[PDB]
Amino acid sequence: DNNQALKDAGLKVTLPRLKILEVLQQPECQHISAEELYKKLIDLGEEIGLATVYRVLNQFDDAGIVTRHHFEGGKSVFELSTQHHHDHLVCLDCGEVIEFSDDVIEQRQKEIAAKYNVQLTNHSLYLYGKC
Amino acid sequence: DNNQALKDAGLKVTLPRLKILEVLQQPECQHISAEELYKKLIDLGEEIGLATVYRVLNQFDDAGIVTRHHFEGGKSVFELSTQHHHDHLVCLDCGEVIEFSDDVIEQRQKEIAAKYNVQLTNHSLYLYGKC
Numbered sequence A, B: 001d002n003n004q005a006l007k008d009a010g011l012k013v014t015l016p017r018l019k020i021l022e023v024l025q026q027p028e029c030q031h032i033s034a035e036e037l038y039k040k041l042i043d044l045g046e047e048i049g050l051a052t053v054y055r056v057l058n059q060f061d062d063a064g065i066v067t068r069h070h071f072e073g074g075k076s077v078f079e080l081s082t083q084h085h086h087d088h089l090v091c092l093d094c095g096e097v098i099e100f101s102d103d104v105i106e107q108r109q110k111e112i113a114a115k116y117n118v119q120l121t122n123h124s125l126y127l128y129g130k131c
């Protein structure tokens, strides 16, 4: 249930919250900016303004419901959380985000981290290109 | 030339814009947060407020003069834009940024994008750790 998920994240149930979460769960909205999410809601006949979308996505960010990624100069995109680690390949023209998890890259990071006297705790990797 | 760089960026040549550009051009301030850059200007006895630093840095970013990196925990580090490839190892404790480049990672990245028919335009790689 979508009520339970909200309540279980310490977040009071409200209608904007439900409607924005609903959208976040749609297969094709797996990676999404506040603007795109707002536009979807418009197409869905809703009146939720973009400021609410932002306010809600922030609350979801802090509650651990979503993860915020800051893309190349400007764009924040959101996705629902998972323990399953991935990195991102981003098309600069199609608004398309491919997830990947390469073993060799994962391993190399650990060794570079250790080449310098750095204890690796987290990373982020974004590849951008034309599709 | 700084006056020229600003004009080429379509930006009015002002004193605040000059001084912040000068700090960014200093070797030991290559990767710098707005707060660090502000503090540095105070140490030079300049009269530029923290707000002005934020605003100008944003104009620079919009204008392609600087590149912004969002690091773990929601802080922005700035550097002057370059084509000179390097990636980032970031000490969460020290607040230092170590540059690195790794042939294997760079090769794997090319193979991954090719596999999804993306022509890479650029990429960011931030490794976070304790130092």
Ligand SMILES: [Zn+2]
Pocket (backbone or CB within 6 Å): A085, A086, A087, A101, A106, A123, A125
């Ligand atoms: Zn990864």
Ligand SMILES: [Zn+2]
Pocket (backbone or CB within 6 Å): A031, A079, A086, A088, A099
């Ligand atoms: Zn993702």
Ligand SMILES: [Zn+2]
Pocket (backbone or CB within 6 Å): B031, B079, B086, B088
């Ligand atoms: Zn850099």
Ligand SMILES: [Zn+2]
Pocket (backbone or CB within 6 Å): B085, B086, B087, B101, B106, B123, B125
């Ligand atoms: Zn690289």
